[PDB]
């Protein structure tokens, strides 16, 4: 007796200790304590469709993210008022669009950290089982591609306008290998190529992120150059140059758990297929986590 619906969700956090941090107090005036009885309820022999590319939960999140946008991200649970309930998909290798066998009724979503970043998704949830390629329409190269990794790679950023990020080159190459492999499955065993972004918006062409009050804009050219896929001086630590901008020392490490990609058109009659980092906007960062959830009215 459920139908697809949209309702004003409310946030719930584990915010405590009345800190000076802005991200935490915001979860006291606008949010509520986390549910002490977080129980799921499996649906017997129920199969239903999903579509994260039309999920209104993403819009409500963003709007709530903007409010605090007007320091460290903390997990936020999105719940429903009386009369509504959240469905949750547990098909492991579900690409975020289509029928879902393993549906379960949850009261709220898990703890999601509103990490704002571009190109690379940080501190997100990892894909169980295999790597998952996500898109509203893969055949349409204009539609965003969300790569959901199943093994995180640490990025260690340091600030001596000067800054740089350090990544284990050997590990990143292993991951990208499996990314190309999984991409190579969708198209037709075609040659998968990664390339740096050309001219465009600053958000699309460089890895942007925050660090307790520091806005980084890192150069991810070395990360997506096929000099290290398939040896040379690639093993060891890659040092990505970065820069600070105001729109002693300090360090911040993060989990690379996903990648936003854009596939190149035109190259349709060739044997290869090119991809570049950066794509979509901030809403897709939330969409990378809210893919399994969907609201329905009772």
């Amino acid at each position: 007796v459920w139908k697809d619906a949209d309702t004003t969700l409310f946030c719930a956090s584990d915010a405590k200790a009345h800190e000076t941090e802005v991200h935490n107090v915001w979860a006291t005036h606008a949010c509520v304590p986390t549910d002490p009885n977080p129980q799921e309820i499996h649906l017997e022999n129920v199969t239903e469709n999903f579509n994260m590319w039309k999920n209104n939960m993403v819009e409500q999140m963003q709007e709530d993210v903007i409010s605090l946008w007007d320091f460290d991200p903390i997990p936020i649970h999105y719940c429903t008022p009386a009369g509504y309930v959240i469905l949750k998909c547990n098909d492991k290798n579900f690409n975020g669009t289509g029928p879902c066998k393993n549906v379960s009724s949850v009261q709220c979503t898990h703890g999601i950290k509103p990490v704002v970043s571009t190109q690379l998704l940080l501190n997100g949830s990892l894909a169980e089982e295999e790597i998952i390629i996500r898109s509203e329409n893969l055949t349409n190269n204009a539609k965003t591609i969300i790569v959901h990794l199943n093994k995180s790679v640490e990025i260690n950023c340091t600030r001596p306008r000067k800054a740089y990020c350090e990544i284990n080159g050997t590990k990143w190459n292993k991951v990208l290998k499996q990314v190309t492999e999984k991409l190579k499955e969708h198209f037709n065993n075609k040659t998968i190529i990664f390339q740096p972004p050309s001219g465009g918006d600053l958000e699309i062409t460089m890895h942007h992120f925050n660090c307790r009050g520091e806005f980084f804009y890192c150069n991810t050219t070395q990360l997506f150059n096929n000099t290290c896929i398939g040896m040379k001086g690639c093993n060891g630590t890659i040092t990505l140059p970065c820069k600070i901008k105001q729109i002693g020392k300090i360090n911040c490490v993060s989990n690379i758990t996903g990648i936003l990609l854009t596939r190149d058109g035109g190259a349709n009659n060739t044997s290869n297929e090119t991809f570049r980092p950066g794509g979509g906007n901030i809403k897709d960062n939330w969409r990378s986590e809210l893919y399994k959830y969907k609201v329905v009215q009772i």
């Epitope: 965003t144 600053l202 699309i204 729109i247």
Partner: antibody, heavy 135, light 101 residues
Amino acid sequence: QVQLVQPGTAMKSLGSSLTITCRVSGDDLGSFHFGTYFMIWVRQAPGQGLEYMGGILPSTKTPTYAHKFRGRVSISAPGVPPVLSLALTNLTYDDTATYFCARERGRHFEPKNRDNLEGKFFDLWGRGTFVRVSP
Amino acid sequence: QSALTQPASVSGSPGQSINISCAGRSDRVSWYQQRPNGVPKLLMFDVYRRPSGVSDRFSGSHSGDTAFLTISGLQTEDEADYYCTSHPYAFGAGTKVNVLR
């Protein structure tokens, strides 16, 4: 609010040199700060058509030119905010023309339809600098 | 870096419809409108996509090898020089559109 500012006119004598500049203005966001956009120059002699003569991606120190203008012209963009420069040398009467600067929109996202565009076009143009080569 | 051919001139009365061909490259084509003594303005990109502010009277199209620009219901405001380009960049000769008054 963002605009490409050009001087306007340049009266030069035959055989002299000149450097036209194209600076961004009203850049509150700082979108041009890191030189992410490919910037070009375009020539248009009096009563003639537009001529793409080359450009540069300021994040790189590597300019590029059309065949006709490869060895005749020097393009660059140095500065904290990159200021696009076009250096002409030994001016001829054939160099008498209007010189526009323009941005290649480049990669960007279109929300209303949610489409990732390559942006191989020029949305933003300068007013143009008319260079007059006189005897 | 490829030569693109355009007809030198075309004219029409107010209300009529006209065509402007862009011979050679029907891939990633941009159109630019230059009114007299004015700066070139982006009219169309990616063959058929219109920037915000551009009237829907303008329409893009391709025919395999040649791109097209249609102007339905010509108006005096449309009198200008129209330039075509693809990638790699190389502007075509240009076409003068005269709107009879």
